[PDB]
């Protein structure tokens, strides 16, 4: 086969989805050209760990994963094996053992507007810190007291997901970011993800 | 000013939709919780619905699950209640009333300090009617010292509810309003009255203003001495 | 460097269908899907559908959905449009682009648009026949105009298809000349006029001819354009 | 998610009738705890409710200082420490500790006054509504208490009975009576058959009935 | 069903001067699904900027767009030759939609029309059918009324006009508008007549023929 991976539409798609609801892509069967993503300066940030981005496109994979959603500045630092914090704990978690690159850059210019984006949200409040990779969509009331809440909103029962700011005149810390979560598994099957020749 | 405008009442025969409208000025709408309360006649109030600061939360009364809906638009500063399949006991004056400001980690004590003038849905099968207007004249013998009484008689109309004014809104002293009847017919009628000094009738004019904003009807009645 | 070429004119009969082809090359056919444009003479853009070259996924227009079918070839990195039963509404040129709006591995919205179009294809929907153009002279008034400056050009009525090409003096003659462009009559047929404005006093020692040639009727015309006679 | 079977209000008395300077005490219960989250209204007469206290004890602004409210969990009472005429409503807890901003049932405060009189008039049918075939003549009782009274209506001296409703406006905010009015229907054939038309009002404050009259014609 | 509408439609302007076009959705658009393209006379239309204010490869620095909810422009700092064309706006953020277009001109001075009338050939009308042209030649603006007159009989419906692209060297147009009649219509009437009404004329001008004219 000969077809390239399409990280294209990954990373450069319209509308990523909220942390506490990020989007998974499956990348199969196709070759990998890592050159267009280590080579594009339109990146903020772009740290590997397991692995070397050079020793990248000489390396075959069974498949690569390509997790995507949206943050602000100040939580892009939890986007790391071993970090704590609201994402860290309640959105978004890597292994400690992590192999694999994430690649994040500011994009104030598309999910801002003027009169504040509530689009994106995050999980504000959760009995327990995900597991890593774990997805949880639930927006169940949240109890903090020891009445219970019966589903009802309101004194001790919370929503449990908070909407992101985001307006275009907010400090960089605030600004929106998107991430892109490259993972990298080798499963005793068939490799299907390599690079060039 | 920190009001809110309802708008949307009407007359509506059962199973069909009527939708409400509630504009904020003055406040940070989209800061608010928002809900909707409505009054059946001669009852209490009752609360209808909720809808969080931007929707994501929703919540109603059993009596309306499943047919009313409630909205909001941000942008444009509004509140809405979508009413499917309405009922005869849908019949009710409607108010929405601004709850307070969710922050981290606190259930807002300021709440339902500000609420809309209410508007009045009427569920049935009933046709509108306009109401006929006619004068109650102050009496021919009246008296020497004072005091004589005049009116309107708003007669034969329908639905609820048609608003009275005196000399537009200059004559609201010694006035009396009273409740509507419902008359064999299906139809409403009501009268007002206002008591004034007897030296006054060939010196004063005295109009009421009768409004059925449901048969876009508005009349302007002179009430006068009878020609003798 | 990324080209496409899409296949050559077509003339067709109201009812008939057309499947118009599109090439590309210098890229990865599997990465961009590919998407069609419509534009009738004298209008603008017309959007008719896309399609995934990984996976033959296609969204059409509603316009023309029960109408169109776009299909792709991988091993001849070549794309296909076919528009069944066709009106003489659908006469347009018909563009192909490689798209970066909708992903062809899992068809979600994209940062981007069409770019490196094609060529075109231009598909005329008449029930007319091929007919070579009839070439009148526009003959120089002797009823003279302020300027000093004399108009003449030739009538080029009643053909079919598009196009013709006129030239004026085996093309010596280019300064002042308009070709205006044709004109779809009732009748079905074109008609296209070409004018040249001379001094008129080159009237009296210069012929003016124009050269007349409609390629789809293998018609070559020359006309002289004089004078009026009595 | 929504039904359980809610924190129910129960509202305490359901009516009570006071005099101008007393002290007054209305009970709002929740049948569960609902912290502070309660808030009081003032609603008169087919007008819009009128924000009294809420936080169980916090004053609305502008809200006159002799009311007062207090309670937290269960219990709250709402507190007038002097009975005022304008006073006169309907008065209704709000509990507000989530989403589910359910009322209590209200609690009606009547006043008592000293008894008075009513004045009474009688208007013949306007001559535009006879042209319509229809009589309407009506009896107005006009500032008067307590609440019952009783209209007589005479055609020729015959009691009349069943052609005629009333209605009763609600005390008045400044002088605290009531007011009635009495419509009598009749036909336009049945309104010229008889001449005197007159009816006798019989109140506490008369000491003998007294009867407005007309004479079709005059 | 997303509508782009386009404003305006045409643009006047010398070279060397700023150009700004703009489109309005019907519908608020998110600003990545919005791209401006160029289309020159005769040729497929090029991208010039996608995600509303990136530039595509290969365009130079005086293109720019920008906006955001229903209101986005293009703009143009330093007009040139070749960019007098027209533009499209388009949005894919539901399904995809064109604007309507908007062409940018090459503004001048005002130049009134020169009017010549042609009758009919004599090999033509042995054909049975007879034309009558009418042109008119090197004006602007764009903007050109004419009105067929056979025997002061005011013509409508048996006439086609046709108009020129801007001339590459004076930026004016020209208009050629044919009346038809069968030979028999024809010899019916004497006087035929066009009258063009333009910018440039401060009063109708007309250009005649009769029938009987050597
Ligand atoms: C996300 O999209 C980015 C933009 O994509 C472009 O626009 C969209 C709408 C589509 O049409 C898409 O097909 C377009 O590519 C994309 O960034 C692009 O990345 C590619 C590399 O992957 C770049 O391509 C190369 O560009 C050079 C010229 O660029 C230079 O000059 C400009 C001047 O300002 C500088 O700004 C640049 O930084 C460079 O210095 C070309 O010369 C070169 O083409 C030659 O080489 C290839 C073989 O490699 C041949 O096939 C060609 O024929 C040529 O011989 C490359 O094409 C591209 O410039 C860049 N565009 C922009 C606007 O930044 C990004 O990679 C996408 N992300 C993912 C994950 O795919
Ligand atoms: N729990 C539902 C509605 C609850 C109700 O039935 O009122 C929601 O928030 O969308
Ligand atoms: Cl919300
Ligand atoms: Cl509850
Ligand atoms: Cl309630
Ligand atoms: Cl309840
Ligand atoms: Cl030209």
């Not at chain 2, 929707?55 to 909001?72: L, N």
């Not at chain 2, 009333?97 to 003038?117: C, H, K, T």
């Not at chain 2, 109650?136 to 004589?148: H, N, V, Y």
């Not at chain 3, 080029?156 to 004026?168: A, G, I, L, Q």
Request: net charge positive; hydrophobic share 30%.
């Amino acid at each position: 086969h000969t077809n390239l991976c399409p990280f294209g539409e990954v990373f450069n798609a319209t509308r990523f989805a909220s942390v506490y609801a990020w989007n998974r892509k499956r990348i199969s069967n196709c070759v990998a050209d890592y050159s267009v993503l280590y080579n594009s300066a339109s990146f903020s940030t772009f740290k590997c760990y397991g692995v070397s981005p050079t020793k990248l496109n000489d390396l075959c994979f069974t498949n690569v994963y390509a997790d995507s959603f949206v943050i602000r500045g100040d939580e892009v630092r939890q986007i790391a094996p071993g970090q704590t914090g609201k994402i860290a704990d309640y959105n978004y978690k890597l292994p400690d053992d992590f192999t694999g690159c994430v690649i994040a850059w500011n994009s104030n210019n598309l999910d801002s507007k003027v009169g504040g984006n509530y689009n994106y949200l995050y999980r504000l409040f959760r009995k327990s810190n995900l597991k890593p990779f774990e997805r949880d969509i639930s927006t169940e009331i949240y109890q903090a007291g020891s009445t219970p809440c019966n589903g009802v909103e309101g004194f001790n029962c919370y929503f449990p997901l908070q909407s992101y700011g985001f307006q275009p005149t907010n400090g960089v810390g605030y600004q929106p970011y998107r991430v892109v979560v490259l993972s990298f598994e080798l499963l005793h099957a068939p490799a299907t993800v390599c690079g060039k020749k | 000013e920190v009001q809110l405008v309802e708008s949307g009442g009407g007359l509506v025969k059962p199973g069909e939709s009527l939708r409400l409208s509630c504009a904020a000025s003055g406040f940070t709408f989209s800061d608010y919780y928002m809900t909707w309360i409505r009054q059946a006649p001669g009852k209490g109030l009752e609360w209808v619905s909720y809808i969080r600061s931007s929707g994501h939360t929703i919540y109603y009364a059993d009596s309306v699950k499943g047919r009313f809906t409630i909205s909001r638009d941000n942008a444009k500063n509004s509140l809405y209640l979508q009413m499917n399949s309405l009922r005869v006991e849908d019949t009710a004056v409607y108010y929405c009333a601004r709850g307070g400001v969710l922050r981290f980690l606190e259930w807002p004590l300021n709440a339902f300090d500000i609420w809309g003038q209410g508007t009045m849905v009427t569920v049935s099968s009933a046709s509108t009617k306009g109401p006929s207007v006619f004068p109650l004249a102050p009496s021919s013998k009246s008296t020497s010292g004072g005091t004589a009484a005049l009116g309107c008689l708003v007669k034969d109309y329908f639905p609820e509810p048609v608003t009275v004014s005196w000399n537009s809104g200059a004559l609201t002293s010694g006035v009396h309003t009273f409740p509507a009847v419902l008359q064999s017919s299906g139809l409403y009628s009501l009268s007002s009255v206002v008591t004034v000094p007897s030296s006054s009738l060939g010196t004063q004019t005295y109009i009421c203003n009768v409004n059925h904003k449901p048969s876009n009807t508005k009349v302007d009645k002179k009430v006068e001495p009878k020609s003798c | 460097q990324v080209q496409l070429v899409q296949s050559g004119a077509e003339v067709k009969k109201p009812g008939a269908s057309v499947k118009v082809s599109c090439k590309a090359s210098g890229y990865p056919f599997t990465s961009y899907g590919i998407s069609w444009v419509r534009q009738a003479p004298g209008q603008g853009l017309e959007w008719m559908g896309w399609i995934s070259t990984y996976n033959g996924n296609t969204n059409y227009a509603q316009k023309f959905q029960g109408r169109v079918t776009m299909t792709t070839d991988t091993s001849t990195t070549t794309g296909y449009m076919e528009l069944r039963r066709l009106r003489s509404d659908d006469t347009a040129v018909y563009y192909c682009a490689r798209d970066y709006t909708r992903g062809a591995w899992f068809g979600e919205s994209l940062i981007g648009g069409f770019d490196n179009w094609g060529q075109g294809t231009l598909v005329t929907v008449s029930s007319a026949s091929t007919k070579g153009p009839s070439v009148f002279p526009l003959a120089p008034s002797s009823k003279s105009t302020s300027g000093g400056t004399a108009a003449l050009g030739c009538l080029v009525k009643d053909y079919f298809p598009e196009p013709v090409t006129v030239s004026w003096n085996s093309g010596a003659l280019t300064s002042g000349v308009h070709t205006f462009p044709a004109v779809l009559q009732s009748s079905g047929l074109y008609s296209l006029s070409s004018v040249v404005t001379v001094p008129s006093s080159s009237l009296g020692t210069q012929t003016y001819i124009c050269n007349v040639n409609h390629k789809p009727s293998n018609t070559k015309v020359d006309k002289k354009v004089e004078p009026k006679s009595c | 998610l929504f039904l359980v079977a809610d924190i129910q209000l129960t509202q305490s008395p359901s009516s009570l009738s006071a005099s101008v300077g007393d002290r007054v005490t209305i009970t709002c219960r929740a049948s569960q705890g609902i912290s502070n989250y309660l808030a009081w209204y003032q609603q008169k007469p087919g007008k819009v409710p009128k924000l009294l206290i809420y936080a169980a004890s916090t004053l609305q602004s502008g809200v006159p200082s002799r009311f007062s409210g207090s309670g937290s969990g269960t219990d709250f009472t709402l507190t007038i420490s002097s009975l005022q005429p304008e006073d006169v409503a309907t008065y209704y807890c709000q509990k507000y500790n989530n989403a589910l901003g359910t009322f209590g049932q209200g609690t009606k405060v009547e006043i008592k006054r000293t008894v008075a009189a009513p004045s009474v008039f009688i208007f013949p049918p306007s001559d535009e509504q006879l042209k319509s075939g229809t009589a309407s003549v009506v009896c107005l009782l006009n500032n008067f208490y307590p609440r019952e009274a009783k209209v007589q209506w005479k055609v020729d001296n015959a009691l009349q009975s069943g052609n005629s409703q009333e209605s009763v406006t609600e005390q008045d905010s400044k002088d605290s009576t009531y007011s009635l009015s009495s419509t009598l229907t009749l036909s336009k054939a049945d309104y010229e058959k008889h001449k005197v038309y007159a009816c006798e009002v019989t109140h506490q404050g008369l000491s003998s009935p007294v009867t407005k009259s007309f004479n079709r014609g005059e």
